Design a protein around this ligand. Structure first.
Ligand code: CDL
Ligand code: PC1
Ligand code: PC1
Ligand code: 3PE
Ligand code: 3PE
Ligand code: 3PE
Ligand code: 3PE
Ligand code: 3PE
Ligand code: 3PE
Ligand code: 3PE
Ligand code: PLC
Lengths: 98, 101, 120, 347, 171, 140, 168, 98
């Protein structure tokens, strides 16, 4: 591939592992989710710019617009979780076991 | 390289003033002194984000006016702005832009 | 498997070439069964709403039967077309590759040796 | 919720799924999924209670993660082939993430732990959308990229789904959880025959949607969500118990009902490819599904459970629920075996 | 695979045109109306051959016309031209509209001394035709023969032989 | 899993029993870690020390079963001079099944495990002889 | 050492990811994601993407990340695991950097090279425009379908969030 | 597509950005326009089962223009050989390479 791709590709892996291992806060994981889209944004832009894929120069912007809209929907749920149990801890969200 | 030096100088200068500001008066020796989530604020931030994203789709308009398909380009340009105004109307009528409990 | 067929018009319920095939008869056994299904749906409609099963809503029962037969007629028309296409492709492919489908050499039972296993 | 906003949100759920099915570009496929997840959360939060809030959160995190993996597969596929077309992927690593992203969205084992819990925390009408409509979009993509899916991966996810759906359902009394595990079990059948004959993946999907929609509709009519509450139906609407018996028997694959057709055709398309061990193991493990279906038939229609005194006040009012297409769905769920050769319309 | 063939260091040598971008930009309009024929032959060569090694001889002809073009200015209009590109060279953007007064003198000088007419707005951007004896390439992409298509299915669509033939169904 | 299985099937049956046992012990040991990997994840141990005790317990029980299958099934093929014989695997499967009962402290599990593990092992040997396929490659 | 600016930035890019991936307090986690975003734009700028790089600052850092920090300060109530994860992350980064700088070839899932990012850049360009800008401006002439679906999704985002946050 | 609505209606919803050799604004080409064109014209109409065998030569060239894997191996070899001879007194870079 190339030398830069290794770190971008390894940055996605770090964020994925970070998202799959919650500690206590729900806000912490949403950041790991928005880190993933940042790595995908940079990785796609590197590919498109280097190959002179002109019409694909708009794709990274579309990736950013939808990923931010999804992030907004994520924060709204976090707020409604905090207004119920007083904190954004994931251990509280355990009613559905039974 | 020029833009890199300009950023380095500005932030390096700011750091110096900050540290010498926390130390220059400490060259002096003064005797030791001793001894609710709001929903409406959150909705302003989220409304700004969705509006801010729609602005991202409008920034390339000046370049988009150089095309040979002005009829198509002018149709979609007025569609995005009209849709952005429709979002404002929905929040306005649904009491989104209010600060009274 | 029959998706990228050479003779194809995508996203068409009944291509033009299907009109050269005989239509399903209005007395088709499959079409009578589809109509019978519509009638059964009518009776259940009365039962779940606590109406007289056999008599209530004869006008409603008539549209249950007609809609099933109407939809059933076209599905059967497409069913017989897709099977006609399969045979059409199967036979054309056999002509194009005669070496892969040779004419079997036929030997009478007087000469072919089959082992005998007695039951004793 | 305002009725007009309810229609608008529903049409956006449909539009998201339709965009996935009419798109020849991976970006529009991804956009289709995003528009679909954005619109379905409000119908899960509509009842405004902690359980709904928890269910919507567990669904968002699962579907958000799945969409990120899918977009990673698309970019890897762009680097190694320089195109966006919705077809076979050109890198084995892209195929794995793509196959795993779709598995998470579908709810296949071992990416299954959210289906029982999300379906339990939302109303019946929201569960009906979740278990039937939300499965169309991922299956459409699998129909198109199956030539490059890793065989051992897709067949391994299929086998686990059949097992975990079976064992999970035995230990359930809540109706919403029983359908959730039933949904996991039937997914394994759809993806087991996918490498061999994708046409039978659609047939099993169509039949599953019809049968599942019939069950949820009958539960919604009597507002029943527990096994016991369903056992009072014989004393309120006797006809509805006979329809539940027939559908439950159909879902179990017992001939001569409709639910035997897909299990019948999938076993045919696998023995043609000299697959004998897998269809037998799949068919035998499906008897677990027939068991906890039969248990509901014993407490609903084949025995008369105890009733309560206040039930007598219900006899004086009719059913005002919509029960849309219930007469038509129930007949299609039971009396379609003689029309099996009609599956060619799906080719 | 193969070995990339490259021309020799003596096959590329030619007398360069060593004048700054301001000098070229001052003479651009007259230059394009005088050396059009050798110029367009070279460009037709490049867009057709798609290989710079195939159009080296046309390239040298482009250089020679430019050298001869500037010598004529060197003989008749030197001071007017030297004063024209000095004003162009002063601006960071090398604007024409800042030097209309000096342009007229240079434009008039060439008109009298050489009969050169400055092309009008929109002339140098026109598609033109060039008569060349170089044969048209047959396989410019060096592509191989395409794989032959599948046999096409043709004939009459007759009904299925005994129907679906699905297990026991008779139609 | 692809490379280790090749090692087991490359060795002809009833020979080099030391290497076959090592191959079987590896597979069972791996299957033990996979099981204990999910057990720790879904059922949190009370402490780190308790976690490693569980992971070691499952890993040894799984590795003990596989160790005795390859050893027992390879010795049997030697004394009987019958490589292509499923009965060799039946003895190995049941021998491994008893070990499972031994670790669980139950005679019922040992008897049930011996019967079913032994039956499954015999089928595996039959498939290798006759080329049965669990994940068949699409052909038609 | 200025020829390897892109690789140096990428190394800082990863270190920031190990920062907030270890999940310190949300206040510091968001701080680390701002650093990675700024470094991320730096990489995109050096590949020729100026509009895309600046769009990261305006929309990602000055947009979403401000809402993240704004929501953290209002709904977050201002260990060994954090340090353990953070140290584990840096070590893997160091070894990946160490090997790709020793033999200039590393194989982890993919075959990566270590010559330098500059070796793949295009060698010819004489246009009177920015190729990146032309593509993005094509959103209005070519991307009619994209504009409609994107705009509708943003409009539905407004409707959906108000529904979720009403609470009654 | 699962449903070919675009082909039925003759409307180009998203086929304009699928490939990098399609029509680009101002006729700006991609770096691998020639290679993509050759592979597309080789594999057209014969299905992907055949194209994986009868158009492998073109595909390998296309993938070589995308990731440039083979070229970087060759340059890497030359750099090592020059470096090895450099630290032995056995090589002398010419004036125009320094
Ligand atoms: C062959 C395949 C055949 C299988 C077909 C299966 C259809 C079965 C539908 C379930 C039966 C309806 C029912 O019992 O009501 C439950 C429920 C109402 O019960 P509720 O929870 O008390 O009320 C909810 C709110 O409180 C709302 O309360 P409200 O008072 O505010 O009312 C809002 C307004 C709202 O009115 C509407 O519902 C209209 C909305 C537009 C529907 C789309 C129209 C399609 C044409 C345009 C394209 O009125 C209603 O809600 C009417 C009650 C619902 C009956 C109408 C349902 C029509 C469904 C048939 C079309 C199927 C298209 C897919 C469904 C959408 C997928 C997300 O209505 C639903 O939301 C069910 C949604 C259906 C999802 C499953 C669709 C099947 C998926 C397979 C599709 C075929 C592919 C294979
Ligand atoms: C609204 C659409 C979403 C709801 C329906 C989702 C059902 C999913 C089940 C699979 C689809 C059924 C098979 C499609 C089919 O055969 O009919 C399409 C038929 C035949 O399409 P086709 O034979 O060209 O192939 C496309 C569909 N696949 C690939 C799945 C076979 O086309 C039409 O009927 C469209 C014409 C009518 C226009 C309305
Ligand atoms: C088809 C799918 C295959 C599934 C196989 C499942 C095997 C389960 C074995 C469970 C045995 C067990 O746990 O011990 C319980 C029992 C002991 O349970 P117990 O000692 O607690 O008492 C049982 C009696 N009652 C119920 C009254 C308490 O083990 C046995 O003794 C059964 C021996 C089985 C012998 C195996 C023959 C297999 C033939 C083929
Ligand atoms: C379970 C059963 C569920 C049944 C649900 C109803 C689905 C079938 C409804 C068919 C209704 C027929 C309407 C009249 C048909 C007609 O007159 O044609 C017009 C139009 C398509 O015609 P067109 O393809 O455009 O021809 C143009 C040629 N120049 O007509 C059309 O729009 C085409 C019909 C649209 C629906 C396509 C459905 C095809 C897939 C079948 C799904 C059901 C398969 C069930 C299989 C069960 C197996 C036992
Ligand atoms: C060969 C010598 C060993 C055998 C000796 C036998 C004597 C008895 C001792 C038993 C030992 C059993 C171990 C056998 C495993 C090794 C043999 C094998 O089959 O290989 C499997 C795997 C090999 O690992 P790999 O580096 O990929 O080798 C590539 C070779 N092609 O090796 C494995 O790791 C398999 C074990 C499962 C690994 C996955 C477990 C989950 C990992 C995630 C951990 C949890 C998530 C991490 C974060 C949690 C927080 C810390
Ligand atoms: C695989 C996932 C391992 C994991 O991270 O689980 C945590 C577990 C012990 O964590 P614990 O101290 O119990 O957490 C506090 C709860 N009171 O961690 C463990 O128990 C350690 C399990 C790893 C054993 C590796 C043996 C080789
Ligand atoms: C990978 C291969 C290594 C296994 C994975 C390493 C983690 C497990 C080793 C744990 C060592 C330890 O301290 O515990 C001893 C362990 C069993 O632990 P124990 O407390 O005795 O529990 C009851 C067991 N019947 O003793 C054991 O039996 C562990 C044996 C490991 C497997 C060898 C085959
Ligand atoms: C062909 C080439 C050869 C290939 C290698 C052959 C060797 C195969 C090795 C077999 C691996 C078996 C995997 C199971 C490992 C044991 C799992 C385990 O650790 O738990 C066992 C479980 C313990 O439960 P318990 O201790 O009571 O609860 C503790 C709570 N703290 O106690 C139990 O409940 C036991 C239940 C286990 C049942 C699982 C199914 C048995 C394994 C199926 C395979 C059968 C075939 C094996 C024979 C060889 C086949 C070729
Ligand atoms: C931990 C325990 C797991 C390890 C124990 C099992 C290991 C042995 C089975 C794995 C496959 C072994 C294998 O690679 O060979 C397959 C075998 C013959 O194939 P082969 O060895 O390659 O011979 C040369 C052919 N050229 O062919 C066969 O194996 C035939 C298989 C016959 C199966 C009979 C068993 C009945 C039960 C059916 C279970 C299968 C369905 C469940 C699948 C689960 C998938 C998640
Ligand atoms: C590949 C390499 C992966 C393994 C690298 C291990 C990196 C993690 C370092 C260990 C660690 O995080 O600390 C111990 C861990 C959690 O930290 P701990 O001290 O237990 O916090 C609560 C104490 N009361 O304690 C645990 O629970 C163990 C978690 C698994 C490690
Ligand atoms: C050589 C390989 C074996 C070596 C270890 C043997 C071992 O350990 O056998 C012992 C084990 C189990 O012992 P346990 O229950 O832990 O003993 C201690 C019990 N307490 C803790 C209660 C005191 O017996 C078994 O489970 C097998 C018993 C049933 C025999 C069935 C044989 C026929 C099966 C086929 C027909 C169904």
């Amino acid at each position: 591939m190339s030398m830069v791709y290794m770190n971008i590709m390894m940055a996605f892996t770090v964020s994925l592992v970070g998202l799959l291992m919650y500690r206590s806060h729900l806000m912490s994981s949403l950041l790991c989710l928005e880190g993933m889209m940042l790595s995908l944004f940079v990785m796609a832009a590197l590919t498109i710019l280097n190959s002179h894929f002109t019409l694909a120069s708009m794709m990274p912007i579309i990736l950013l617009v939808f990923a931010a809209c999804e992030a907004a929907l994520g924060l709204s749920l976090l707020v409604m979780v905090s207004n119920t149990y007083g904190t954004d801890y994931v251990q509280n969200l355990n009613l559905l076991q039974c | 390289m020029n833009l890199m030096l300009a950023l380095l100088t500005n932030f390096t200068l700011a750091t110096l003033l900050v540290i010498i500001a926390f130390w220059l008066p400490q060259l002096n020796v003064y005797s030791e002194k001793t001894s609710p989530f709001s929903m409406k604020f959150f909705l302003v931030a989220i409304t700004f984000l969705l509006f801010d994203l729609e602005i991202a789709l409008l920034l390339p308009l000046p370049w988009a006016s150089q095309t040979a398909n002005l009829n198509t380009m002018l149709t979609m340009a007025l569609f995005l702005i009209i849709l952005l105004a429709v979002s404002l109307a929905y929040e306005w009528t649904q009491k989104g832009l209010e600060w009274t409990e | 498997m029959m998706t990228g067929r050479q003779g194809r018009a995508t996203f068409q319920f009944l291509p033009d070439e299907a009109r050269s095939l005989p239509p399903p008869k209005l007395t088709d056994p499959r079409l009578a069964f589809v109509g019978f299904l519509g009638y059964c749906s009518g009776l259940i409609d009365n039962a779940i709403r606590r109406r007289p099963v056999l008599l209530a809503g004869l006008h409603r029962q008539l549209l249950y039967i007609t809609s099933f037969v109407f939809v059933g007629y076209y599905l059967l028309k497409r069913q017989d077309y897709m099977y006609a296409v399969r045979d059409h492709d199967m036979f054309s492919y056999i002509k194009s590759h005669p070496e892969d489908f040779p004419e079997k050499d036929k030997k009478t039972y007087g000469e072919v040796f089959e082992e005998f296993h007695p039951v004793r | 919720m305002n009725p007009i906003i309810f229609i608008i949100i529903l049409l956006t759920i449909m539009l998201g799924t339709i965009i996935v099915m009419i798109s020849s570009h991976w970006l529009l496929v991804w956009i289709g999924f995003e528009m679909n997840m954005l619109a379905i959360i409000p119908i899960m939060m509509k009842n405004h209670n902690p359980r709904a809030t928890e269910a919507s959160t567990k669904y968002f995190l699962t579907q958000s993660t799945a969409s990120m993996l899918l977009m990673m597969a698309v970019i890897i596929n762009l680097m190694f082939s320089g195109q966006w077309t919705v077809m076979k992927l050109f890198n084995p690593m892209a195929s794995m993430l793509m196959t795993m992203a779709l598995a998470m969205k579908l709810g296949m084992a071992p990416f299954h732990f959210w289906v029982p819990e999300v379906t339990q925390g939302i109303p019946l009408s929201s569960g009906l959308i979740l278990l039937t409509w939300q499965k169309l979009a991922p299956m459409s993509v699998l129909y198109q990229i199956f030539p490059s899916i890793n065989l051992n991966l897709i067949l391994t996810l299929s086998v686990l789904s059949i097992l975990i759906g079976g064992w999970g359902g035995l230990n359930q009394t809540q109706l919403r959880k029983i359908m959730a595990y039933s949904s996991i079990a039937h997914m394994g059948w759809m993806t087991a025959v996918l490498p061999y004959n994708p046409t039978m993946t659609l047939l099993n999907l169509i039949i599953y949607i019809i049968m599942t929609s019939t069950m949820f509709t009958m539960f919604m009519a009597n507002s029943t969500t527990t096994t016991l509450s369903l056992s009072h139906t014989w004393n309120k609407t006797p006809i509805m118990t006979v329809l539940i018996l027939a559908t439950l028997l159909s879902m179990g694959g017992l001939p001569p009902l409709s639910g035997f057709m897909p299990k019948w055709m999938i076993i045919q398309e696998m023995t043609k490819n000299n697959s004998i061990i897998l269809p037998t193991f799949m068919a035998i493990t499906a008897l677990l599904n027939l068991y906890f279906y039969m248990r509901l038939t014993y407490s609903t229609t084949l025995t008369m459970f105890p009733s309560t005194n206040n039930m007598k006040m219900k006899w004086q009012f009719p059913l005002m629920k919509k029960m849309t297409f219930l007469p038509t769905m129930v007949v299609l769920s039971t009396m379609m075996l003689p029309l099996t050769p009609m599956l060619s319309v799906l080719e | 695979p193969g070995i990339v063939e490259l021309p020799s260091l003596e096959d590329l040598k030619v007398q360069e045109v060593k004048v700054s971008s301001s000098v070229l930009k001052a003479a651009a309009h007259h230059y394009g109306a005088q050396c059009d024929k050798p110029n367009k032959e070279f460009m037709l060569c490049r867009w057709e051959e798609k290989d710079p090694r195939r159009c080296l001889e046309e390239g040298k002809l482009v250089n020679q016309c430019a050298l001869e073009f500037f010598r004529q200015i060197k003989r008749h209009c030197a001071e007017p031209f030297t004063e024209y590109w000095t004003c162009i060279d002063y601006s960071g953007l090398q604007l024409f509209r800042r030097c209309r007064k000096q342009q007229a003198q240079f434009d008039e000088c060439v008109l009298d001394k050489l009969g050169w007419v400055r092309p009008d707005l929109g002339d140098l951007s026109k598609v033109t035709k060039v008569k060349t004896d170089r044969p048209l390439p047959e396989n410019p992409y060096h592509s191989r023969a395409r794989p032959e298509p599948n046999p096409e299915v043709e004939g009459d669509l007759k009904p299925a032989r005994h129907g679906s033939r699905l297990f026991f169904w008779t139609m | 899993a692809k490379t280790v299985l090749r090692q087991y099937w490359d060795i002809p049956e009833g020979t080099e029993c030391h290497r076959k046992t090592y191959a079987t012990t590896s597979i069972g040991g791996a299957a033990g870690l996979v099981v204990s990997a999910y057990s720790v994840a879904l059922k949190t141990p009370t402490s780190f020390l308790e976690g490693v005790a569980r992971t070691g317990r499952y890993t040894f029980t799984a590795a003990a079963i596989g160790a005795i299958f390859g050893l027992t099934s390879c010795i049997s093929a030697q004394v009987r001079e019958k490589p292509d014989d499923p009965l060799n695997y039946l003895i190995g499967g049941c021998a491994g099944g008893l070990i499972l009962g031994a670790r669980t402290r139950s005679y019922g599990i040992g008897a049930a495990a011996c019967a079913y593990m032994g039956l499954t092992a015999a089928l595996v040997k039959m498939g290798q002889l006759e080329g049965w396929q669990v994940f068949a490659e699409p052909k038609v | 050492m200025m020829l390897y600016i892109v690789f140096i930035l990428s190394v800082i890019f990863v270190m920031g990811f190990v920062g907030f991936s270890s999940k310190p307090s949300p206040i510091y986690g968001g701080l680390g994601l701002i650093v990675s975003g700024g470094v991320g734009c730096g990489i995109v700028l050096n590949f020729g993407g100026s509009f895309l790089g600046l769009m990261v600052f305006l929309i990602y850092l000055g947009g979403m990340m401000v809402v993240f920090g704004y929501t953290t300060a209002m709904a977050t109530e201002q260990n060994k695991a954090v340090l353990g994860a953070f140290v584990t992350g840096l070590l893997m980064e160091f070894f990946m950097v160490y090997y790709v700088l020793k033999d200039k070839e590393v194989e982890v899932v993919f075959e990566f090279n270590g010559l330098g990012d500059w070796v793949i850049y295009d060698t010819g360009d004489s246009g009177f425009f920015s190729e990146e800008a032309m593509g993005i401006a094509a959103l209005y002439s070519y991307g009619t379908w994209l504009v409609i679906v994107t705009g509708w999704s943003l409009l539905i985002g407004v409707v959906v969030i108000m529904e979720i946050t009403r609470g009654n | 597509p699962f449903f070919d609505v675009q082909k039925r209606l003759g409307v180009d919803l998203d086929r304009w950005m699928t490939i990098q050799s399609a029509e680009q604004p101002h006729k700006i080409p991609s770096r691998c326009h020639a290679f993509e064109k050759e592979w597309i014209e080789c594999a057209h109409g014969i299905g992907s089962i055949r194209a994986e065998k009868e158009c492998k030569i073109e595909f390998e060239d296309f993938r070589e223009c995308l990731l440039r894997q083979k070229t970087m191996k060759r340059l890497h070899a030359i750099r090592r050989q020059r470096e090895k001879l450099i630290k032995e007194g056995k090589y002398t870079p010419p004036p125009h390479h320094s």
